[PDB]
Each structure stands twice: as structure tokens, then as C-alpha cells.
Design an enzyme around this catalytic site. Structure first.
Site, PDB file in Angstrom:
ATOM      1  N   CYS A  10       0.804  -1.221   0.000  1.00  0.00           N
ATOM      2  CA  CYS A  10       0.000   0.000   0.000  1.00  0.00           C
ATOM      3  C   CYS A  10       0.837   1.271   0.000  1.00  0.00           C
ATOM      4  O   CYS A  10       1.972   1.286   0.476  1.00  0.00           O
ATOM      5  CB  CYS A  10      -0.942   0.017   1.207  1.00  0.00           C
ATOM      6  SG  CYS A  10      -0.110   0.240   2.790  1.00  0.00           S
ATOM      7  N   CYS A  13       2.421   3.061   3.262  1.00  0.00           N
ATOM      8  CA  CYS A  13       3.715   2.589   3.748  1.00  0.00           C
ATOM      9  C   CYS A  13       4.868   3.109   2.896  1.00  0.00           C
ATOM     10  O   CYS A  13       6.013   3.150   3.346  1.00  0.00           O
ATOM     11  CB  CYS A  13       3.745   1.058   3.777  1.00  0.00           C
ATOM     12  SG  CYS A  13       2.639   0.309   4.997  1.00  0.00           S
ATOM     13  N   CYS A  18       7.660  12.360   6.848  1.00  0.00           N
ATOM     14  CA  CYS A  18       7.682  13.818   6.805  1.00  0.00           C
ATOM     15  C   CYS A  18       8.616  14.435   7.842  1.00  0.00           C
ATOM     16  O   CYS A  18       9.792  14.677   7.564  1.00  0.00           O
ATOM     17  CB  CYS A  18       6.261  14.374   6.978  1.00  0.00           C
ATOM     18  SG  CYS A  18       5.403  13.868   8.489  1.00  0.00           S
ATOM     19  N   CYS A  24       6.929  11.143  14.555  1.00  0.00           N
ATOM     20  CA  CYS A  24       7.912  11.199  13.475  1.00  0.00           C
ATOM     21  C   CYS A  24       9.106  12.103  13.767  1.00  0.00           C
ATOM     22  O   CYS A  24      10.238  11.779  13.408  1.00  0.00           O
ATOM     23  CB  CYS A  24       7.236  11.658  12.181  1.00  0.00           C
ATOM     24  SG  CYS A  24       8.328  11.728  10.743  1.00  0.00           S
ATOM     25  N   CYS A  40       5.912   7.513  11.808  1.00  0.00           N
ATOM     26  CA  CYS A  40       5.266   8.741  11.362  1.00  0.00           C
ATOM     27  C   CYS A  40       3.751   8.598  11.407  1.00  0.00           C
ATOM     28  O   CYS A  40       3.211   7.521  11.154  1.00  0.00           O
ATOM     29  CB  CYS A  40       5.709   9.084   9.938  1.00  0.00           C
ATOM     30  SG  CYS A  40       4.930  10.561   9.246  1.00  0.00           S
ATOM     31  N   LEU A 459     -13.772 -24.377   4.738  1.00  0.00           N
ATOM     32  CA  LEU A 459     -13.697 -25.834   4.666  1.00  0.00           C
ATOM     33  C   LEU A 459     -14.977 -26.504   5.161  1.00  0.00           C
ATOM     34  O   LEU A 459     -15.416 -27.510   4.602  1.00  0.00           O
ATOM     35  CB  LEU A 459     -12.502 -26.331   5.488  1.00  0.00           C
ATOM     36  CG  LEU A 459     -12.199 -27.829   5.515  1.00  0.00           C
ATOM     37  CD1 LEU A 459     -12.093 -28.369   4.100  1.00  0.00           C
ATOM     38  CD2 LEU A 459     -10.904 -28.062   6.272  1.00  0.00           C
ATOM     39  N   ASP A 498      -9.006 -18.516  22.163  1.00  0.00           N
ATOM     40  CA  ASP A 498      -7.794 -19.225  21.754  1.00  0.00           C
ATOM     41  C   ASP A 498      -7.988 -20.738  21.827  1.00  0.00           C
ATOM     42  O   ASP A 498      -8.729 -21.232  22.669  1.00  0.00           O
ATOM     43  CB  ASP A 498      -6.625 -18.824  22.655  1.00  0.00           C
ATOM     44  CG  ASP A 498      -5.314 -19.442  22.218  1.00  0.00           C
ATOM     45  OD1 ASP A 498      -4.324 -19.329  22.969  1.00  0.00           O
ATOM     46  OD2 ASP A 498      -5.269 -20.035  21.120  1.00  0.00           O
ATOM     47  N   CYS A 534       0.380 -21.297   9.905  1.00  0.00           N
ATOM     48  CA  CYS A 534       1.798 -21.570  10.073  1.00  0.00           C
ATOM     49  C   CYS A 534       2.532 -20.234  10.091  1.00  0.00           C
ATOM     50  O   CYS A 534       2.918 -19.715   9.046  1.00  0.00           O
ATOM     51  CB  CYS A 534       2.294 -22.435   8.916  1.00  0.00           C
ATOM     52  SG  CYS A 534       3.594 -23.584   9.376  1.00  0.00           S
ATOM     53  N   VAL A 884     -11.267 -21.723   2.484  1.00  0.00           N
ATOM     54  CA  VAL A 884     -10.946 -22.781   1.536  1.00  0.00           C
ATOM     55  C   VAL A 884     -12.053 -22.905   0.492  1.00  0.00           C
ATOM     56  O   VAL A 884     -13.239 -22.898   0.823  1.00  0.00           O
ATOM     57  CB  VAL A 884     -10.773 -24.141   2.253  1.00  0.00           C
ATOM     58  CG1 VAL A 884     -10.563 -25.247   1.234  1.00  0.00           C
ATOM     59  CG2 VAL A 884      -9.587 -24.080   3.198  1.00  0.00           C
TER      60      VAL A 884
HETATM   61  N1  LIG Z   1      -5.067 -20.861  17.481  1.00  0.00           N
HETATM   62  C1  LIG Z   1      -6.128 -20.120  16.998  1.00  0.00           C
HETATM   63  N2  LIG Z   1      -7.292 -20.084  17.675  1.00  0.00           N
HETATM   64  C2  LIG Z   1      -8.332 -19.379  17.233  1.00  0.00           C
HETATM   65  N3  LIG Z   1      -8.270 -18.662  16.099  1.00  0.00           N
HETATM   66  C3  LIG Z   1      -7.145 -18.635  15.351  1.00  0.00           C
HETATM   67  C4  LIG Z   1      -6.012 -19.376  15.785  1.00  0.00           C
HETATM   68  N4  LIG Z   1      -5.032 -19.189  14.872  1.00  0.00           N
HETATM   69  C5  LIG Z   1      -5.461 -18.397  13.937  1.00  0.00           C
HETATM   70  N5  LIG Z   1      -6.760 -18.018  14.177  1.00  0.00           N
HETATM   71  C6  LIG Z   1      -7.580 -17.103  13.335  1.00  0.00           C
HETATM   72  O1  LIG Z   1      -8.216 -17.765  12.201  1.00  0.00           O
HETATM   73  C7  LIG Z   1      -7.923 -17.060  10.959  1.00  0.00           C
HETATM   74  C8  LIG Z   1      -7.480 -18.015   9.851  1.00  0.00           C
HETATM   75  S1  LIG Z   1      -8.893 -19.116   9.584  1.00  0.00           S
HETATM   76  C9  LIG Z   1      -8.360 -20.196   8.229  1.00  0.00           C
HETATM   77  C10 LIG Z   1      -9.570 -21.091   7.920  1.00  0.00           C
HETATM   78  C11 LIG Z   1      -9.315 -22.083   6.780  1.00  0.00           C
HETATM   79  N6  LIG Z   1      -8.920 -21.381   5.555  1.00  0.00           N
HETATM   80  C12 LIG Z   1     -10.572 -22.897   6.524  1.00  0.00           C
HETATM   81  O2  LIG Z   1     -11.793 -22.319   6.558  1.00  0.00           O
HETATM   82  O3  LIG Z   1     -10.477 -24.074   6.265  1.00  0.00           O
HETATM   83  C13 LIG Z   1      -6.886 -15.979  11.245  1.00  0.00           C
HETATM   84  O4  LIG Z   1      -7.326 -14.704  10.775  1.00  0.00           O
HETATM   85  C14 LIG Z   1      -6.639 -16.002  12.763  1.00  0.00           C
HETATM   86  O5  LIG Z   1      -6.898 -14.720  13.356  1.00  0.00           O
HETATM   87 ZN   LIG Z   2       5.289  12.286  11.242  1.00  0.00          ZN
HETATM   88 ZN   LIG Z   3       0.725  -1.099   4.450  1.00  0.00          ZN
END
Ligand SMILES: Nc1ncnc2c1ncn2[C@@H]1O[C@H](CSCC[C@H](N)C(=O)O)[C@@H](O)[C@H]1O
Ligand SMILES: [Zn+2]
Ligand SMILES: [Zn+2]
Ligand SMILES: [Zn+2]
Ligand SMILES: [Zn+2]
Length: 904
Positions: A10, A13, A18, A24, A40, A459, A498, A534, A884
Site C-alpha cells: 500500500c 507505507c 515527513c 515522526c 510517522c 472448509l 484461543d 503456520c 478454503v
Molecule cells: N489458534 C487459533 N485459535 C483461534 N483462532 C485462530 C487461531 N489461529 C489463527 N486463528 C484465526 O483464524 C484465521 C485463519 S482461519 C483459516 C480457515 C481455513 N482457511 C478454513 O476455513 O479451512 C486468522 O485470521 C486467525 O486470526
Molecule cells: Zn510524522
Molecule cells: Zn501497508
DNA sequence: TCCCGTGAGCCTCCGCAGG
DNA sequence: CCTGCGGAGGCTCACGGGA
């Protein structure tokens, strides 16, 4: 402990620091203190996100040239000297010219049928071989021989070094050696799966040789040992191997059945079979494009530019390759020649076939396939004889009128199904009506799925279409995606947190979470799937204690852990293509040794999303696993033809080329999908336009469109909004030729007033390039004084991006960047955020002067229009980008249905 | 004479207390 | 909010084989 980062594409960036605002100015290189540590205020990157995005266009897929493995367990096995070798007992059974026995003695030692002997190779580099003696006999002249079913060492498998030193695998390799070749009687135990397997969760990251899984050398598959049982006429010399090789050889050779008449030394039959398929007179048949040629004359196929006006144009130094779909025909007659005196004749079975016409075959040519159905044909009066061993499958083609239902329903209820409505004549180039003699003669329990890393539900959507799974639990940390998932899967509670957190709960034994939701427990989950990001190691270099440790705490192992405390029937791990090569292919080998350690049945391969109903180059890695009591699924078979370039499906690990169970590596049933078929019915919209909902100013104009369009009574075209490119970017875009293949390299080097009144100056090549020379007009071609970098040589607010030519000389001329998509072409690996200067950034709308929109990206993927999204414009793009291709997931899920129905 | 490739070290900020 | 700080990635530059 992961922080995001700014993108390097983009404009925001690119702009220089400036030096008029707080941050900055407070920099250290500005005399300030620097104790602030910031950027900045005019550099705040919007497309800012984690660099978890891997698979950075690498050339590790190239250099495919390589022979097939199947070592043959080597050759020339050292021979040993024996003092005494006497049999024991009465010959178990002596038929023809042999006499088998029960046991045997080699220098006092006793070898019994079923014992595992060992042999020494001829090269001191290859370890000692092992085998399970399946027989012992005395030939009428050869002497004392034995049949040794070979054992594949673990260090000769994909696992190579990560393989347990004591683990061996069953292989369909076996010879008939001369007893004297034996070395020792090694004992090998069978570590069979526990009766109560699906409960041995919690665990941490042998004493003698043991086997537990069968290994396929060429496909890298780990399946359960064959349950093949012996009979009474071989129970004494049974060899699982030979049996498999015998049945496999019987499935290959094409045979014939019922007959009808004998004429001109050529009997006419009614039925014949090949590779397990039943071909009857009146059925459909696939055939290589080299089969026959329609009498339709096979469709047979500028001055220099202002050198000074279009400077960087010279840089253009370095679906057209897409093969033809399968040939379709009706089997009218089935026969076989004959040598006067005999009537039948195998190895030479012929077939009388009625050639079918695809729209892109008639005189009307290729453009006819624009509004046609990918499964529509035309009946003709032409015929042709083809060698039976040439057919490439079995298909169904019926009269569109005799169809006892809706045509749109008939096609969706079957795999390879076609239909015609009119007859075509080559000579008269007309469309007649099909003769009357052309007309026909006239569920299992859904799997409870848990999809962690569910995203927007990519998926998952695929399986729900294949009717194989039932996502009841989804784990998504990113609130945006999570929310979206709920909008598509209301019957499942989404755990928006998580993954490491939840598993840390259920393992510690718990019923609910803070919010108060039922957590999945042992046994509840039947199927597990997802795409682990990954990030902490998108490398390619050798692993090291520092990074390796960063791996043992990744999100890949966490996914494996879930696969451990749930031991689901089917486990799927989708990811980028380069997953099979990261860290010297180590990450792959480990996740396999990990699954094999759990006594799982697993395999791996690479698929090209395009070959399954998508106008997009999206190669992805796939790791399939199945419970000890199931059948390891096969890989989806390409449904659409695709450019051989984006199909380097093969994969190599440590001088070993591995492939898949895929046969169609070239042709296919349906024609390739184009950008036209993908997004041609979409209304003209301007850059930035953020209108969430709008109507379809025009009915569907493509098959792939009439499908995704949906059948909702609400014509709501949701999310047809694209990013708001800079006023300057809008300029660059408007100056890009609609000529197929145009990109930044064809931008005018002039000054133009923008929609901001502000004028962008031209570019100055005040330097020389010792690798490019001068222009046709002796003009300079160097942008920076490095062609050390002279920061003062930098230029901003210019039509032709200063940077591009600067680095251009070492990144293949950034061919594609700021390029436009051509109607006949296909989207490049869809991304999470479209940016003209992004690695894979050829994203400029074919004609309109803007970037592809969210809905258009939805179309790039398999996502229908009925599918919903959530969040702001950028939030949406990322969901679709990660997801997917549903068409891939579906076709990948069906290969699993054939496993649930396998039962056994 | 070019290429990676493999680090060690300087550079450039993002979350985050913490005020 | 700063206001400044701890500390993670990446970007650059000095070699060391390998054709
Ligand atoms: N350990 C984790 N727990 C919960 N969410 C996660 C995670 N790791 C990554 N994510 C989130 O999930 C997103 C990728 S989801 C990828 C989904 C896959 N393409 C499918 O539908 O088959 C990312 O934007 C991230 O913010
Ligand atoms: Zn600046
Ligand atoms: Zn950018
Ligand atoms: Zn055998
Ligand atoms: Zn420079």
C-alpha cells in the site's frame, strides 16, 4: 505472544517520513530522543496484519525432474555360506513339482513359516533387510527356496529420521530367494491398536522390532494391515503380497462378458469391464482428446511503442496451456476381432461409439461455452471405433427431455452426469433434433464435526454441501470470522477464543467456559478438521534448537493435540502448499510421525483448487488421517481441466518423489473455469463504492454463475464493495491497457492532474543500468544510484512507482503487479488483502478501473452469494482470503463418503 | 562472477503497562 | 489519552561453499 506488522505494498507505507508531527519528529535520526519508539503519523498502515501469511511464491515446486522410488528393496542381496540345511517333518503339501514344509533348520537354528528372517544387502550403506517368510519348499531342480515378504525399515519411509528406530512397515515387496541368503531369525511383534483406543488421550511429546501399519512407497500412505485370509489350497504358503498383486493385476486387464453374435471373425458382445467399472451398451464413456477428431475443421487460430513514452515497457521480456476436456460418447456396439478358427480375443477389444459435441466443439467454437452448462452436449450422426483399453472412465448422458425431473436437479444428484437437448450436424453446420432412437430405453448419519481455525467457515461449508459432516463446534479467535461463522452455521456454538485455552480446560476436566457453553468431550467429536496458521516458522532452512522450540509451541502441534484427546474418525489438516517443504520438509515429516505415533492411518498430497471448479491458482497441502477402524480416504479426482503450469502437484522429500492417488493429471470431465464465468454478471461499480447491498442489473450469463447466484427469492447482491484506492493509485489504474496481460510495465511516463487537483510528476532515470543498457532512444534506465542506495535519489507521488524499477532488476520485473485480470485468464492465488503492489497482486478488474471487490473475491473462491460475511471491508477480504474453496472441500469430502460407506 | 544461504547485529516499531 | 519501555521480527551486510 505474536504481534502484527505493516504490509509493504500500500501507498501509506511508501510515503516518506515527513517530520512535522510529534512521533515522526521524536525519532533518533532527527535529533530527537527516540525514547518514544514510534512511526510517522502519516505511515499508519491500514492493511496492517500479522505476517502469518506464508507460501511466499517460491521456486521449490519447480525442478520436478525425478525418477520413481520403489527401491525394490535394492538388489543383489549378499549370499551366506551354510553348513547344514535339513527340513523337518513331512512335506505339508507336494503338488506339481514342489514340496513345501512346516519348519527348517539352518545350522541348528529353527526357522518357522511366519518367522521374520533377515538378509544382508550388497552395499554396506543400506541397512539389513527383514522379511516374514511366507513359505518353504524343495523344487525338483532349483533346490531349497523360500518366499520372503519384505519389511520396510522406518528410515526408508517419508518419516526417514523422525521414524522410531524399532518401527517397521508392511510393503507389497517380495521375492523367492535361496535359503542360504539368510542371516538371522529376528523376532518382530505386532503392536496392534488397543480395543479401547479412542480414549487414550493425554500423553507426552519399544524394546524390539515391531510393525503396526502398511506403507505405500509411491503414495506415502499409512493404512491398516490387510485382513486378507488364506484358504486351504495355500494356507501353508500364503503371501498377503502376492494375493494383493494378483487381484490388482486382475483388476487391470480388461475383460468381456455376455455375447450376441459371431460375424466376420468378430463376436459382438453386450457387456465388458475394466478397472472395476461396468460398461454396458448404452452407457456413457470418457476418452482422451486423441481419441477422435470431429469432422468440424479443427478451429485454427503491433508496431514498436514510443520508446520514450513507455520506458519500463521493455521489461516485458519473458488457460492457453489448458488441455482439452474428455471426449464423450455412447457405446453402441462392443466386440472383438478373431483369428479364423477362434471366436473371442482379449487384449484387443474394440468399441463402437457415438461422438458427442461440446459447445466449444461446433463451428460456433469456444465462445459458445459462455452460457452453456458444463455438462451440456449435442447428439450427432458421426461414429468412431476406439480401442477399449483407451476409455478413461464411465459417465451418464441422458436426453434432457426424458429426464423424469428438473434438469437442474438431475445434474446435482450425480457425479459424472451429462445431458443433451439437440442434435448437431457438422456438414450442414446446423442444429437438428435428436433422433428418436437416441433417447434412453424408456443416506448415512452425518459426522459430528469440530472445526478449529474455522475462519468464516470455508472448509466447513464444503462438507455441509457433500453431506458428510455436521459442524457443531467451531473455534475462532478472530471475532470477525467467528461471528460470520455463526451467521452460516446457527446450529453450532462458536467458541470465540484461543485454541490452547479450551484444550487446557477439557484436559483439566471441565464442562463449560466463562461465557457458559458446552465444551466438546471425549467421543462427542467424530470428525476433526481445520487450517492451522503456520506463522512462527514460515522458513525453509534447517531447523534449530531456537526455532524448533518455537515450533513445539506452535498452532500445528496444538491441532495435533486436539487430534489426540479426541481420536476422531477422520482428521483433516489443510494448509498452504509449501507446508510440505517448510524447514526442510521437517514440519511435514513430524506431523506425520506424530499421527503415526498415535497409530493413525494417514497420507498427504497437494491439490489445485482450480481443477475442482474454481478460476484460481490455489495449490494447497492436505493431511488426511483415519481411525484404526476406518478406510483411509483417497484424493479427489480433478473435475475440471487446468493450465499444466499451476499443477506441479508432485512433492519431493529427501531425494524421494511422492505423488498421490490421482490419475487425471491432464484432461478432465468438465471445461476449465474462466474469469468471465466467475464475474461477468456483476454491475459496473466505481473505486471505493461501499454499497453493502444492491441489485443484479442482469440475469446470470454463465453456468458457474447460475449456481453461485443461488435460488433465493431475494436478488440481494451483498458485499459488492471494493477498497478505496488512493487518488494517485486511481490514476495509475486508469492508465493500464485492457490488453490481456497489461501491468505497470506498460504505464505512461507523463504528468497528470489527479482527482485531488494535485499533479503527479514524471519519473527520472538519472542513472545507468549495466544490465539493461539504454532505451531505443538512448535514454537512461536506472532509477537509483545503486543499479549504495542514494536516499536522495528517491522519488514520490509519481505515476510509475519509483520502487518497482529500483528493485525490478532482481524480482523478475515484478511481472503482474498492478496488472489487470484477463477474461480468459484466472485469478492468481486469492489473498487476504488485495493491493496492486502485493506479491500476488495482479488484481485489477479486467475492464473497470478498480480492484476486485469482496463479492468478486467470493466468486474467485467457491463461496455462493447466499453465504454471509461480517466486519468492515478489510475484515471481509481477509475472511475470504483465508477460507478454503468450498468446491474443493466438497470434492474432498466426497472422497470420505466412500469411506463411511466402506464400513466393513 | 554470480547465487543463495546462515547468521549476527542494527533498525523499526507494536502492544502495553503505568501514569 | 499519552510517554516511555520491553523486546519481537525483519532488513542489511559480512562471509563461505557451490557451480
Ligand atoms: N489458534 C487459533 N485459535 C483461534 N483462532 C485462530 C487461531 N489461529 C489463527 N486463528 C484465526 O483464524 C484465521 C485463519 S482461519 C483459516 C480457515 C481455513 N482457511 C478454513 O476455513 O479451512 C486468522 O485470521 C486467525 O486470526
Ligand atoms: Zn510524522
Ligand atoms: Zn501497508
Ligand atoms: Zn510374495
Ligand atoms: Zn537503491
Amino acid at each position: 505472544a505474536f504481534k502484527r506488522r505493516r504490509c509493504g505494498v500500500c501507498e501509506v507505507c511508501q510515503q516518506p517520513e515527513c517530520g512535522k508531527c510529534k512521533a515522526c519528529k521524536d525519532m533518533v535520526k532527527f535529533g530527537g530522543s527516540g525514547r518514544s519508539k514510534q512511526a510517522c503519523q502519516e505511515r499508519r498502515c491500514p492493511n496492517m496484519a500479522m505476517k502469518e501469511a506464508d507460501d511466499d511464491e517460491e521456486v521449490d515446486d519447480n525442478i520436478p525432474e525425478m525418477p520413481s522410488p520403489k527401491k525394490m528393496h535394492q538388489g543383489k542381496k549378499k549370499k551366506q555360506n551354510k553348513n547344514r540345511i535339513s527340513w523337518v517333518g513331512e512335506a505339508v503339501k507336494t503338488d506339481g513339482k514342489k514340496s513345501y514344509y512346516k519348519k527348517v533348520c539352518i545350522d541348528a537354528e529353527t526357522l518357522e513359516v511366519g518367522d521374520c528372517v533377515s538378509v544382508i544387502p550388497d552395499d554396506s550403506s543400506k541397512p539389513l533387510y527383514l522379511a516374514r517368510v511366507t513359505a518353504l519348499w524343495e523344487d525338483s531342480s532349483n533346490g531349497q527356496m523360500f518366499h520372503a515378504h519384505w519389511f520396510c525399515a522406518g528410515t526408508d519411509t517419508v518419516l526417514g529420521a523422525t521414524s522410531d528406530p524399532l518401527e517397521l512397515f508392511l510393503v507389497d515387496e517380495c521375492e523367492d530367494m535361496q535359503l542360504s541368503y539368510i542371516h538371522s531369525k529376528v523376532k518382530v511383534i505386532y503392536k496392534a491398536p488397543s480395543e479401547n483406543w479412542a480414549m487414550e488421550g493425554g500423553m507426552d511429546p519399544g524394546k524390539t522390532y515391531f510393525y503396526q501399519l502398511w506403507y505405500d512407497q509411491d503414495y506415502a500412505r499409512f493404512e491398516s494391515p490387510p485382513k486378507t485370509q488364506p484358504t486351504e489350497d495355500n494356507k501353508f504358503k500364503f503371501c498377503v503380497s502376492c494375493a494383493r498383486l494378483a487381484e490388482m493385476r486382475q483388476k487391470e486387464i480388461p475383460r468381456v462378458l455376455e455375447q450376441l453374435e459371431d460375424l466376420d471373425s468378430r463376436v459382438l458382445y453386450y457387456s465388458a469391464t475394466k478397472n472395476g467399472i461396468l460398461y454396458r451398451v448404452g452407457d456413457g464413456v470418457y476418452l482422451p482428446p486423441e481419441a477422435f477428431t470431429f469432422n468440424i475443421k479443427l478451429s485454427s487460430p503491433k508496431e514498436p511503442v514510443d520508446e520514450d513514452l513507455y520506458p519500463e515497457h521493455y521489461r516485458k521480456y519473458s488457460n492457453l496451456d489448458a488441455p482439452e476436456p474428455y471426449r464423450i460418447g455412447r457405446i453402441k456396439e462392443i466386440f472383438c476381432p478373431k483369428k479364423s478358427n477362434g471366436r473371442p480375443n482379449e487384449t484387443d477389444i474394440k468399441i463402437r461409439v457415438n461422438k458427442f459435441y461440446r459447445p466449444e466443439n461446433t463451428h460456433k467454437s469456444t465462445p459458445a461455452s459462455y452460457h452453456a452448462d458444463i455438462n451440456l452436449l449435442y447428439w450427432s450422426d458421426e461414429e468412431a471405433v476406439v480401442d477399449f483399453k483407451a476409455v478413461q472412465g464411465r459417465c451418464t448422458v441422458e436426453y434432457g427431455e426424458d429426464l423424469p425431473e428438473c434438469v437442474q436437479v438431475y445434474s446435482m444428484g450425480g457425479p459424472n452426469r451429462f445431458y443433451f437437448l439437440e442434435a448437431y450436424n457438422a456438414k450442414s453446420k446446423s442444429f437438428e433434433d435428436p433422433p428418436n432412437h437416441a433417447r434412453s430405453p424408456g443416506k448415512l448419519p452425518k459426522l459430528r464435526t469440530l472445526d478449529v481455525f474455522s475462519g468464516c467457515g470455508g472448509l466447513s461449508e464444503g462438507f455441509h454441501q457433500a453431506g458428510i459432516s455436521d459442524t457443531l463446534w467451531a473455534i475462532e479467535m478472530w471475532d470477525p470470522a467467528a461471528q460470520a461463522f455463526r451467521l452460516n452455521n446457527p446450529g453450532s456454538t462458536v467458541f470465540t477464543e484461543d485454541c490452547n485455552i479450551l484444550l487446557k480446560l477439557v484436559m483439566a476436566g471441565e464442562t463449560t467456559n466463562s461465557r457458559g457453553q458446552r465444551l466438546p468431550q471425549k467421543g462427542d467429536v467424530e470428525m476433526l478438521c481445520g487450517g492451522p496458521p503456520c506463522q512462527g516458522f514460515s522458513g525453509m532452512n534447517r531447523f534449530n534448537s531456537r526455532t524448533y522450540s518455537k515450533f513445539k509451541n506452535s498452532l500445528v502441534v496444538s491441532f495435533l493435540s486436539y487430534c489426540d484427546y479426541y481420536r476422531p474418525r477422520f482428521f483433516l489438516l489443510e494448509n498452504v502448499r509449501n507446508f510440505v517443504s517448510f524447514k526442510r520438509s521437517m514440519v511435514l515429516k513430524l506431523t506425520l510421525r506424530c499421527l503415526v505415533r498415535m497409530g493413525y492411518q494417514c497420507t498427504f498430497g497437494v491439490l489445485q483448487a482450480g481443477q475442482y471448479g474454481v478460476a484460481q491458482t490455489r495449490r494447497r497441502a492436505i493431511i488426511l488421517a483415519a481411525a484404526p477402524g476406518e478406510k483411509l480416504p483417497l484424493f479427489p479426482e480433478p473435475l475440471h481441466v487446468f493450465a499444466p503450469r499451476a499443477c506441479q502437484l508432485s512433492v519431493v522429500v529427501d531425494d524421494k518423489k511422492f505423488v498421490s492417488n490421482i490419475t487425471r493429471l491432464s484432461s478432465g470431465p468438465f471445461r476449465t473455469i474462466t474469469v468471465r464465468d466467475t464475474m461477468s454478471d456483476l454491475p459496473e461499480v466505481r473505486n471505493g463504492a461501499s454499497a453493502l447491498e444492491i441489485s443484479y442489473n442482469g440475469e446470470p450469463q454463465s453456468w458457474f454463475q447460475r449456481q453461485l447466484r443461488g435460488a433465493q427469492y431475494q436478488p440481494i447482491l451483498r458485499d459488492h464493495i471494493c477498497k478505496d484506492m488512493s487518488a494517485l493509485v486511481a490514476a495509475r489504474m486508469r492508465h493500464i491497457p485492457l490488453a490481456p496481460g497489461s501491468d505497470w510495465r506498460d504505464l505512461p511516463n507523463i504528468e497528470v492532474r489527479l482527482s485531488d487537483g494535485t499533479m503527479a510528476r514524471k519519473l527520472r532515470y538519472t542513472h545507468h543500468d549495466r544490465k539493461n543498457g539504454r532505451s531505443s532512444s538512448g535514454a537512461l534506465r536506472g532509477v537509483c544510484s545503486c543499479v549504495a542506495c542514494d536516499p536522495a535519489a528517491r522519488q514520490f507521488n509519481t505515476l510509475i512507482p519509483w520502487c518497482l524499477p529500483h528493485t525490478g532488476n532482481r524480482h523478475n520485473h515484478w511481472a503482474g503487479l498492478y496488472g489487470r485480470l484477463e477474461w480468459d485468464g484466472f485469478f492468481s492465488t486469492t489473498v487476504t488483502n488485495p493491493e496492486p503492489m502485493g506479491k500476488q497482486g495482479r488484481v485489477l478488474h479486467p475492464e473497470q478501473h478498480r480492484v476486485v471487490s469482496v463479492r468478486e473475491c467470493a466468486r474467485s473462491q467457491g463461496f455462493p452469494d447466499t453465504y454471509r460475511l461480517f466486519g468492515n471491508i478489510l475484515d471481509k477480504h481477509r475472511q475470504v482470503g483465508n477460507a478454503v474453496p468450498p468446491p474443493l472441500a466438497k470434492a474432498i469430502g466426497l472422497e470420505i463418503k466412500l469411506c463411511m460407506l466402506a464400513k466393513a
